[PDB]
Structure 1
Amino acid sequence: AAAFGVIASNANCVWIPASSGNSNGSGPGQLITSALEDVNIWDIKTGDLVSKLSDGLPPGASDARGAKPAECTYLEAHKDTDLLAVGYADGVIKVWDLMSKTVLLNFNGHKAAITLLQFDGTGTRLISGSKDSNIIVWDLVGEVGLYKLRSHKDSITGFWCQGEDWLISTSKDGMIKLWDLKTHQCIETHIAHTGECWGLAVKDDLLITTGTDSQVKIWKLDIENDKMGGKLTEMGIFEKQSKQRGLKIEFITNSSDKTSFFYIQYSSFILHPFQTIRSLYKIKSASWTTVSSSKLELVLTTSSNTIEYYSIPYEKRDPTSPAPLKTHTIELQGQRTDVRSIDISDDNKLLATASNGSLKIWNIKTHKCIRTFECGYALTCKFLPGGLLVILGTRNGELQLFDLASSSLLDTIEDAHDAAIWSLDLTSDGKRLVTGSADKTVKFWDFKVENSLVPGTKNKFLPVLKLHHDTTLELTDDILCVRVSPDDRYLAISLLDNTVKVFFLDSMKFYLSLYGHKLPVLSIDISFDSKMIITSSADKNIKIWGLDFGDCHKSLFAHQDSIMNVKFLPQSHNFFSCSKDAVVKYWDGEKFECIQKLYAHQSEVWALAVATDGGFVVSSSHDHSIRIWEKAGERLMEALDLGIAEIEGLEAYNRDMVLIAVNKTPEQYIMDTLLRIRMSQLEDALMVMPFSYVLKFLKFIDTVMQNKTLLHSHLPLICKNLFFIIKFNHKELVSQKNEELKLQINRVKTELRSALKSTEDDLGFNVQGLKFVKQQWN
């Protein structure tokens, strides 16, 4: 068959909320670029959407982005504002063009995600420490073989000087390690922690540290035999980050105690009045602090899914702090938090998602207006067919009536509930409302305009349907999903006894109960053919049902995490699965097999619905946004020919006016082949070699005996090979003439017999020296 969806990175998605800030980077001075679930471009003093880098169509590339989901770790601009560089929640670091959003290089070699990433003062080096507990230096070529420093067990925090040499390090394993740049060796490790280094800042000359121990340690730069001058104890809780002023006359510190405080005579004490402030520090613990590039403000990055602006009391800057400004969001992070329910209209232009405090109106990606009465999140949402009014179910058991035009509530629907509303859906014409409640009954609701004594705009409750006392061992009376027959003939209900019951529109008569469920059911739906159904349960198992009982068609079981929602197609041919494990799967309604497996989801999907147009995909989420869809001996001969080729060349160097074997002397390779060779069958490789191999060979023995080296060999090896070649051939069957190597042997053997005679005398005194006191100790 044919199904929608694509394998591309973008299908007009609005899935990026541009939220959850953790860091930032200053750019042109009048602007500032922000780490979010994208790269976002804000003004430094107004807060408007200057630009935004996200997924899309880069110039000259497909399935490429400007920025990824799966939250950015760090984000900074180059000092010449020519290079963009972001490390993400994956180990690959992505650099980007500054004018365009094409990619320049992709940087891997990281086992884990980035915990440190910053430009150096040269610009030709980019340093990245990641959560695989090491540091990786980067060159514009991509040189990773320069320096890989690792003696850690946890991540690293503190780093660079500004002198091309003489690095420093503070790490999250409670350690502060000292290293030189030339041939790196841990000269000294200063430790004053027991936990994690949260933030780090050098002021200009004093390196303070912030950790779990809720204290401040100062340290001097020119350091040896540790320089300690004092500690500032007990801010009140463990400190998280700090920042120096760009003029370097103050030093601001921040913690998770909702407070920030700076030092001034900087000093070792806080000596400035702080009651001048008007815009108190923060409502949520902040991640990172940077001074603003206008030299008058402070820029704060919080964990309340948004970052803010303030100022520090001083005469040069603003002596108070101003109200925080936020960017021009599309009304996706201009309001507060996550989406638990979505609802669909029949005009493909009214799509509403709800939050803790907002209802947001959408056509495709353009936001019309907000509606605010929310006393919680919404478990269910439902438009009127026609999109005139919308009906809301909050986490109070309250249903709310909202007009399409304005934010104002027309009518509060009667709170006859005592628990929150699980399910709710209207009928075809939309005059009957069936709801989710633990009140042991089914509540039908009227609906019309307000022109009579029965309010249809307040939904007066005439009929009572209640027989719900079915006894079971799991849970007797609670409902999760309710479904209206598309023929308007019956009502389908989810029940907590691992069953479902089917019953027509009037008074209770029984059609069908379905059971066999190890876990209770999450969602139940009906095909528009109205012959077969599906059901989703908490056992990772999706069950197809027609009209029988107990004869299992198929246990649709291929999953690992809990199942949020599985629904049919609006023309009943494709049922789809959204779950906890951040993947949405298409499944053919006529077959058992999958046609497309959509995995571009990083955060949790709570709900997902497709309109009756079927050309786009609406998805509730945990990042509150919507992803819209569609042999050896010859090597010895080479070794001796290379080695004598070196020695003969070095002989007439200037007494008479090759990069590798391996060493400063080539003869060390000659022993190394003796080191590499096995102790067995070496005589077969030795017996091949001719007499000239011997004449080339003894020069290396004279080389090591004049070299006095026994580090890379030993005398039973040399005498072992010597005794082999004197077995093989020869002295007077290879030469009858008195030659120079022949006279060389006569002194080399003297060197050998003396060199072994020394150690033999050493043992010969040693063991008899050991005997004599053992005679006495009795």
Structure 2
Amino acid sequence: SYQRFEQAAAFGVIASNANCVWIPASPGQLITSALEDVNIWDIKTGDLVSKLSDGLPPGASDARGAKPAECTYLEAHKDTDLLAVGYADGVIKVWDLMSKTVLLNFNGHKAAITLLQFDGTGTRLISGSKDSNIIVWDLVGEVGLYKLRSHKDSITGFWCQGEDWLISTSKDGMIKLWDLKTHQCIETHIAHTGECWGLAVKDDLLITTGTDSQVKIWKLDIENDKMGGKLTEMGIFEKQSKQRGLKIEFITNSSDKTSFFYIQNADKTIETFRIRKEEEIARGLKKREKRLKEKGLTEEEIAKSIKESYSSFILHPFQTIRSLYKIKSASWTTVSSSKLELVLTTSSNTIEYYSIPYEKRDPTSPAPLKTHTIELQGQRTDVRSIDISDDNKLLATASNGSLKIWNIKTHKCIRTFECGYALTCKFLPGGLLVILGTRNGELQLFDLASSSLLDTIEDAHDAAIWSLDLTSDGKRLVTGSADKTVKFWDFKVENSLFLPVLKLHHDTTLELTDDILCVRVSPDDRYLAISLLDNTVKVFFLDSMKFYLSLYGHKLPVLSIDISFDSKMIITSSADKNIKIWGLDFGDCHKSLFAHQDSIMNVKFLPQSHNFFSCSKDAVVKYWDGEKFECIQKLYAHQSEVWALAVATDGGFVVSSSHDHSIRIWEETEDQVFLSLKAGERLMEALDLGIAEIEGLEAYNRDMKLWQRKKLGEAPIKPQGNAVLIAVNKTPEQYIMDTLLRIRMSQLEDALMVMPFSYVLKFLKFIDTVMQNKTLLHSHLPLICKNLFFIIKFNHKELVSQKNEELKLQINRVKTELRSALKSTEDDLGFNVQGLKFVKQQWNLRHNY
């Protein structure tokens, strides 16, 4: 029986890979995506109000084998307190914010959700995804009303107001107006050459950003019934950034009725522009007319100049918001007469609040002011190393630019230290000190209580300190670096000139031929395993530095080395997707495991056992039994490649930090894992149904004729149409025609043979009713001839024996209509034959000698 491992936490991510929706205060609250879950952040306090999680924790028994789908879009409706979350698989979930439960679940999209938009009533939700479809969902019935599928690439943006018209812009460079009455595209224009990334519509103004710096301005005239008049290209203007712009959004001041919009960019900039008022635009037009009169240009030339500059008349560049990080999403949060305020969630895991003070013409301050920031409870750059303290009560995550000490139990950041490019970190005994190794070769020692660096050794190594380890007492340190050396440091306390301060002094150096990637000291301090770029790992006795063994058999360099507690077993995991388990008594290899589809970055034995965790670039954490060399549990909660792994001394929990800026804890649980009808019969039933309907309709028409002639008595009631005919929307003539077409050529003779004589008479009635219709008769003329002639030949004697004046009249009508149609086709063929022969004869006569 092996204990189950389940995820118990996920902290370290603020906003990641989806747009942020602002929730106004009762600066308000911001809803952001945190990978598989949703965060709500209070801006003024910088605290997480609530977290919405989908269901069962990953790594559980009922969890799916694939990685969870990240939240790819958010759209909140304030009237009903609802929020639509669009995940990466295509799942749209509707959470009521008060109850935090999934009210509605839709799965209509094969790819990631790109944009969601509620209608004003809150009853329909419009969803555009990567699979080039726009789907409208009815929240009342939890169904998909209709799907819009003429786009050749992913829907970048759309706009829908009213139940009549929609406008969509996609990555194929193309914009379409959609009539929702017929679910069909009315007008299709090419917006930009490569892609059409951003769309925003304001009254009769439509703004689209594509792949280039230029932005296109369009007039929307829906009521124009002429084809091509719905969308018109007025002019182009150029924003400064050469990067393409994902999101455009308008907002209007309530009092002054002015409108400002913003164009996001892929870069760090967001460009806010202002539309001038109608009177201001008229005054500018008058000023340009005066300028053209002063210039003396022709009126047609002045008209061309006005058409060229008309893009510059509506818009003026108001300001540009710049941030330290690449921007993922933004939102106009509020507008007053004094300021314009904007919230932006960046690429490197921050939320920033910006304010722009203005006086209706130009902004007062040269740059927008960053008021509030939510950057405390997260990491800016991916975690390269983690360490759980000796008490298992604290965690330390070291990355490029920051070392943060977290409380595991309360899931937040106790302390934050500034540092360099941190490749490896470790705890000194007692949990009071953290030791770091930087890519510059520097070695920094942080103190938790004093909250500052105690000792920094700048020239600890010439090249990057790739790995670092302490002995069991912590008195000695072994640093392995890319300068092809391994240096031993000793910690000793010196009294101040009088508190003792720890100091690290360099004792010994071992110069190897190549780079040292990983270094591990065994728990009993007898063995020192040193990886190399020669794809080999050496093992030294820690006492006397005697060279014991060299373990080889790895194609690519060994990235992680780990030693069991009894020091009988060592594990090397390398970049050739292999975990090799060696015995340290002699150096034989017990096992080689092809574990992941990409490199295994880290491997950690559990304390007091030979089971071990593996941590790889496949974004999978795999728990392994080293007793029978088999994988126990597979953990899939991580989205992208996972860098660091640490195990508690009790073995209760295993912490993993990945590229997706998320730190997760895997805890032991109480549960335990253990390692029909024949052809012809359809014709008779179709004849029964159709001839019954035809005879009923004819009797009803005769009853109406008689009642209208009499002009007295009750009017007869029209018989109800047959349910199959109404459902399929087919006249009985077309229904029996389709049954004849469904009957194959081989079975046809047996079908017509097996029908009895009453069905033969019904067939003749059907044929007469078809003769009444000239389109269907000419569409299926040879089939009708073949079937009717075979029926008459097979049943000639009985049909002759029948003495019915109605049957004689039916045969006369059928004969006349058959011969009329057949001789019409015959006349066409003969005329064409003689004409084409004449044409060929004339050409031969002209070009003959």
TM-score by length of 2: 0.76
The 3 A distance-change label for structure 1 pair 555 and 217 is same
The 3 A distance-change label for structure 1 pair 435 and 239 is farther
Check the 8 A contact 2:519/2:531 in 1, yes or no. Answer: yes
| Partner Cα separation in structure 2 for residue 182 and residue 380 of structure 1 | 62
1:290 to partner: Cα distance: 8.2
1:355 to partner: Cα distance: 2.7
Name which of structure 1's ranges 486-495 and 671-680 shifts more when overlaid on structure 2: 486-495
Name which of structure 1's ranges 745-754 and 254-263 shifts more when overlaid on structure 2: 254-263
What does residue 624 of structure 1 align with? 661
Name which of structure 1's ranges 582-591 and 619-628 shifts more when overlaid on structure 2: 619-628
Check the 8 A contact 1:172/1:198 in 2, yes or no. Answer: yes
| Partner Cα separation in structure 1 for residue 21 and residue 560 of structure 2 | 26
The 3 A distance-change label for structure 1 pair 774 and 363 is closer
1:705 to partner: Cα distance: 1.3
| Partner Cα separation in structure 2 for residue 496 and residue 471 of structure 1 | 22
What does residue 185 of structure 1 align with? 184
Which string of whole-angstrom CA distances, capped at 9 and with x for unpartnered residues, describes residues 695-729 of structure 1? 11112211121111237842221111112112211
Which string of whole-angstrom CA distances, capped at 9 and with x for unpartnered residues, describes residues 34-69 of structure 1? 677632223466654333334678999998999997
| Partner Cα separation in structure 2 for residue 230 and residue 664 of structure 1 | 38
The 3 A distance-change label for structure 1 pair 242 and 703 is farther
Name which of structure 1's ranges 435-444 and 205-214 shifts more when overlaid on structure 2: 435-444
1:135 to partner: Cα distance: 1.0
1:164 to partner: Cα distance: 0.9
Check the 8 A contact 1:298/1:310 in 2, yes or no. Answer: yes
| Partner Cα separation in structure 2 for residue 60 and residue 484 of structure 1 | 31
Which string of whole-angstrom CA distances, capped at 9 and with x for unpartnered residues, describes residues 395-447 of structure 1? 21111121121322222235231112111111011111100123333211111
SS at match of 1:639: helix
The 3 A distance-change label for structure 1 pair 142 and 155 is farther
1:78 to partner: Cα distance: 1.3
Query: How many residues are matched?
Result: 762
The 3 A distance-change label for structure 1 pair 498 and 382 is same
SS at match of 1:357: strand
Unpaired runs of at least 5, structure 1: 19-26, 454-460
More strand by share: 2
1:609 to partner: Cα distance: 1.0
The 3 A distance-change label for structure 1 pair 754 and 220 is same
1:681 to partner: Cα distance: 2.8
SS at match of 1:274: strand
* Pairing 1:127-142 to 2, within 5 Å after superposition: 127-142=126-141
Check the 8 A contact 2:343/2:352 in 1, yes or no. Answer: yes
The 3 A distance-change label for structure 1 pair 326 and 577 is farther
Check the 8 A contact 1:204/1:248 in 2, yes or no. Answer: no
- Among 516, 530, 533, the alignment partner of 1:479 is 516
Check the 8 A contact 1:159/1:169 in 2, yes or no. Answer: yes
| Partner Cα separation in structure 2 for residue 2 and residue 235 of structure 1 | 54
More helix by share: 2
Which string of whole-angstrom CA distances, capped at 9 and with x for unpartnered residues, describes residues 232-284 of structure 1? 99999999999999999995799999999859999844777968999999889
Name which of structure 1's ranges 186-195 and 664-673 shifts more when overlaid on structure 2: 186-195
Check the 8 A contact 2:9/2:665 in 1, yes or no. Answer: no
1:694 to partner: Cα distance: 1.6
Unpaired runs of at least 5, structure 2: 1-7, 265-309, 669-678, 705-723, 844-849
1:638 to partner: Cα distance: 1.0
| Partner Cα separation in structure 2 for residue 283 and residue 269 of structure 1 | 29
The 3 A distance-change label for structure 1 pair 573 and 149 is same
Which string of whole-angstrom CA distances, capped at 9 and with x for unpartnered residues, describes residues 607-651 of structure 1? 111011111111122133321111921211111110111011111
- Among 10, 19, 39, the alignment partner of 1:12 is 19
The 3 A distance-change label for structure 1 pair 578 and 162 is same
The 3 A distance-change label for structure 1 pair 264 and 387 is closer
SS at match of 1:65: coil
Check the 8 A contact 2:19/2:73 in 1, yes or no. Answer: no
The 3 A distance-change label for structure 1 pair 317 and 359 is farther
Name which of structure 1's ranges 437-446 and 110-119 shifts more when overlaid on structure 2: 437-446
Which string of whole-angstrom CA distances, capped at 9 and with x for unpartnered residues, describes residues 487-545 of structure 1? 22232211222222222234443311111222221111111122121111111111111
1:329 to partner: Cα distance: 9.4
Name which of structure 1's ranges 344-353 and 263-272 shifts more when overlaid on structure 2: 263-272
* Pairing 1:596-635 to 2, within 5 Å after superposition: 596-630=633-667, 632-635=679-682
Check the 8 A contact 2:557/2:575 in 1, yes or no. Answer: yes
| Partner Cα separation in structure 1 for residue 547 and residue 490 of structure 2 | 24
| Partner Cα separation in structure 2 for residue 263 and residue 464 of structure 1 | 55
Check the 8 A contact 2:10/2:662 in 1, yes or no. Answer: no
The 3 A distance-change label for structure 1 pair 32 and 227 is farther
| Partner Cα separation in structure 2 for residue 389 and residue 766 of structure 1 | 101
1:334 to partner: Cα distance: 5.1
Check the 8 A contact 1:444/1:463 in 2, yes or no. Answer: no
The 3 A distance-change label for structure 1 pair 496 and 235 is farther
The 3 A distance-change label for structure 1 pair 347 and 647 is same
The 3 A distance-change label for structure 1 pair 583 and 14 is farther
Which string of whole-angstrom CA distances, capped at 9 and with x for unpartnered residues, describes residues 80-116 of structure 1? 1332211022211111122111111221121111112
Q: Does 1:444 align with 2:444?
A: no
The 3 A distance-change label for structure 1 pair 654 and 287 is same
SS at match of 2:664: coil
1:209 to partner: Cα distance: 0.8
Check the 8 A contact 2:437/2:444 in 1, yes or no. Answer: yes
Which string of whole-angstrom CA distances, capped at 9 and with x for unpartnered residues, describes residues 463-492 of structure 1? 999999999999931111112132222322
1:568 to partner: Cα distance: 1.2
| Partner Cα separation in structure 2 for residue 217 and residue 256 of structure 1 | 28
SS at match of 2:607: coil
The 3 A distance-change label for structure 1 pair 510 and 284 is same
CA RMSD, aligned part only? Answer: 7.4
| Partner Cα separation in structure 2 for residue 88 and residue 11 of structure 1 | 9
| Partner Cα separation in structure 2 for residue 317 and residue 77 of structure 1 | 33
What does residue 773 of structure 1 align with? 839
1:124 to partner: Cα distance: 1.4
Which string of whole-angstrom CA distances, capped at 9 and with x for unpartnered residues, describes residues 311-358 of structure 1? 344347995579999999997645533211111221111221123222
The 3 A distance-change label for structure 1 pair 5 and 394 is closer
The 3 A distance-change label for structure 1 pair 289 and 214 is farther
The 3 A distance-change label for structure 1 pair 528 and 268 is same
| Partner Cα separation in structure 1 for residue 437 and residue 505 of structure 2 | 22
What does residue 23 of structure 1 align with? none
| Partner Cα separation in structure 1 for residue 459 and residue 760 of structure 2 | 106
Which string of whole-angstrom CA distances, capped at 9 and with x for unpartnered residues, describes residues 577-634 of structure 1? 1100111111112111122112222232101110111111111221333211119212
The 3 A distance-change label for structure 1 pair 602 and 155 is same
Check the 8 A contact 1:338/1:356 in 2, yes or no. Answer: yes
The 3 A distance-change label for structure 1 pair 258 and 543 is farther
| Partner Cα separation in structure 1 for residue 13 and residue 258 of structure 2 | 48
What does residue 264 of structure 1 align with? 263
What does residue 791 of structure 2 align with? 725
